[PDB]
Symmetry: C3
Subunit: 109 residues, 3 copies
């Protein structure tokens, strides 16, 4: 009876040991995925910070989009293609267009 009980005990111990081995694998696999995600989050935080710094964004107090950037309150917007010149146009106009207008005036004068 006691040798049987010892065999029972040892069988139970082997099973526990096997389960523990698998658990160590599972915790490792998990911690690899978590480390991956922690790194990814760090990179995302940088990207979000940069987008926030660099996007031309709405200014609630001004009730308009603002071309302020960092420590510079006013800045150019460039690479703006020519806007439609019409009574209903809501396109921004660029310096080539104002140049043309100024030339019409100087020619007029």
């Amino acid at each position: 009876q006691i040798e049987d009980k010892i065999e029972e005990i040892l069988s139970k111990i082997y099973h526990i040991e096997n389960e523990i081995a698998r658990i160590k694998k599972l915790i490792y696999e998990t911690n690899q995925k978590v480390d991956q995600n922690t790194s990814a989050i760090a990179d995302i935080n940088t990207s979000i910070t940069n987008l926030g710094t660099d996007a031309l964004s709405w200014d609630d107090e001004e009730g308009a989009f603002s071309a302020s950037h960092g420590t510079s309150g006013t800045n150019k917007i460039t690479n703006v293609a020519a806007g439609e010149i019409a009574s209903d146009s809501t396109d921004a106009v660029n310096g080539s267009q104002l140049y043309e207008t100024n030339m019409l005036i100087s020619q007029y004068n």
Copy 2:
């Protein structure tokens, strides 16, 4: 005394088996959270990619905001409300405003 000892060992083995059952559940639960975050991060990466592509942003080669996009280095900005026309105005002006100016000149000529 050895029957007592055997029963105490079997008791502790039962306890350990219970711990292992709990541990397995915890690991599964933890992995469900990690899975959710891994998939949330993939979604975030796409969002950030698209925001970077679509937000009018600062350009460190221009020292200005740049309307480059896709295969065109210049693009229009539209749905721009009329800017204040005043000596100290920093508002963008639209094609309707330039149209009016051009019309004043034209009528004179």
Copy 3:
């Protein structure tokens, strides 16, 4: 022999107990990281939502950046520095520049 067997069994159970305590600690530590990451992803989703609402963004149907915002189909862009007035300038122009042009015309008249 059997008293000896029992001693060896107890020694192994002691080792198992140490492994279980370590595993618990590792799972705790993993979950502290996962919690930190879940929160960080929550913050990121808020930043992304806000950047989307507030960035001046590309509009596929317009093929242009759009100063639409919220319920308002058109809005101002302000804090725009004066653009180059030249035949190949792609700088946006501001209200102070159009004011100046408008005063040339009113002078010429």
